[PDB]
Design a protein around this ligand. Structure first.
Ligand SMILES: Nc1ncnc2c1ncn2[C@@H]1O[C@H](COP(=O)(O)OP(=O)(O)O)[C@@H](O)[C@H]1O
Ligand SMILES: Nc1ncnc2c1ncn2[C@@H]1O[C@H](COP(=O)(O)OP(=O)(O)O)[C@@H](O)[C@H]1O
Ligand SMILES: [Zn+2]
Ligand SMILES: [Zn+2]
Ligand SMILES: [Zn+2]
Ligand SMILES: [Zn+2]
Ligand SMILES: [Zn+2]
Ligand SMILES: [Zn+2]
Ligand SMILES: [Zn+2]
Ligand SMILES: [Zn+2]
Ligand SMILES: [Zn+2]
Ligand SMILES: [Zn+2]
Lengths: 209, 209
């Protein structure tokens, strides 16, 4: 079937614009948030396999892999976690109100740090701190493989998409803003993971390109 | 199926090598060769539709589209020509010897201009003058959609791949070398097309991304 275009719930769109359009000095927290989302997805498939071992027929190895691509100005974060169905992508990454959204916009306006984002249940949108466009390819055992994509602007699209690397899990491809390309450096990624994601229970693989 | 890997026939591998590893000025002829190939593919479907109009059920509009992406350092040339089956990709872009290959290598080493490539029946490999990697998505009415990819290793891969943009024809994505990013400029492209591809009988659309 075709690409379908969804609107972001209104407060999510406002938060996005505020995220993209306001200077923050502490942008590195996007990586903490996305790694923390991958870890939760990994937990969920790990616990599921304790009663249902065949949920790992789509891949036993549980990990996160980070791939900076300086030539193309993309940062990719992939995990072999539970993945998201078409409905999860539509429901969890844009259309449904989140209770923390509006509160976080108000906290930011009052001068709170951007690093609080995860506490408000909207950590995924930290990707827009460093990215102009974000593409999410995801395959859950209960659905076919789909792709969510948004350049902000109040809407996102979801289309069918098969990636032979994603047999179960989520690949997030961030298209890095010109003023944020520092985050594509091997050394910078290593430092941020080492300093802010040192307690994650899965291997984090960093591949250079 | 999944990805299959194919060795280039020996002389083609040697020609690709000579082409990537020797400095040539007049690299700009790659665009002329690729457009000429697109124009041939357009002609073939055009003539086919004269007796089998249902060959145009997969798209009536006959054109070429050029898309530079400076961010991603890619240049895309796309046509709605006859397209290539899996077998065409495998047979016509690498595995079968062409009689002009060796003759072209010796002509090059004897100092002939790179612009003569087309006259030797090997115009396609001019893409590797400006690109490190070339990815070809093609769909022919007699087969499923497939993708050919090479970084000139002495081999190429062919995998299944659907691109909603290609319902019939061919899309060439060139990953442009660091020193050749000038070819991504709107001004330069138009000027190369205006001077060297002047008499092509199909619309050539340029889209700036
Ligand atoms: N890597 C992922 N794999 C599976 N689902 C994810 C992934 N990243 C995000 N999601 C889904 O998107 C939702 C929103 O993420 P986020 O905005 O970080 O909020 P939170 O993690 O606080 O729930 C998650 O709860 C989860 O359902
Ligand atoms: N855009 C295209 N669409 C369909 N077939 C193509 C395309 N480009 C190249 N090919 C196939 O690859 C072959 C090799 O092309 P090339 O190396 O330029 O040689 P020639 O064009 O002299 O045949 C072509 O003959 C054609 O069969
Ligand atoms: Zn989160
Ligand atoms: Zn199930
Ligand atoms: Zn479904
Ligand atoms: Zn990009
Ligand atoms: Zn800097
Ligand atoms: Zn430091
Ligand atoms: Zn830090
Ligand atoms: Zn040709
Ligand atoms: Zn590239
Ligand atoms: Zn010229």
């Amino acid at each position: 079937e075709n690409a379908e275009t969804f609107a972001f719930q209104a407060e999510i769109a406002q938060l996005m614009s505020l995220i993209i359009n306001t200077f923050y000095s502490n942008k590195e927290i996007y990586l903490r948030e996305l790694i923390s989302n991958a870890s939760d997805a990994l937990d969920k498939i790990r616990y599921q396999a304790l009663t249902e071992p065949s949920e790992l027929d789509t891949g036993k190895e549980l990990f996160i892999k980070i791939t900076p691509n300086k030539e193309e100005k993309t940062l990719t974060i992939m995990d072999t976690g539970i993945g998201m169905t078409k409905a999860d992508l539509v429901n969890n990454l844009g259309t449904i109100a989140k209770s923390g959204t509006k509160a976080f916009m108000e906290a930011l306006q009052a001068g709170a740090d951007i690093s609080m984002i995860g506490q408000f249940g909207v950590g995924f949108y930290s990707a827009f701190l460093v990215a102009d466009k974000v593409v999410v390819t995801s395959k859950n055992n209960d659905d076919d493989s789909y792709q969510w994509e948004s350049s902000a602007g109040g809407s996102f699209v979801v289309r069918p998409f098969n990636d032979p690397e994603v047999t179960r899990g989520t690949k997030i491809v961030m298209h890095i803003k010109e003023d944020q390309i520092d985050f594509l450096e091997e050394r910078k990624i290593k430092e941020i993971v080492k300093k802010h994601s040192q307690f994650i229970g899965y291997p984090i693989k960093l591949v250079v390109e």
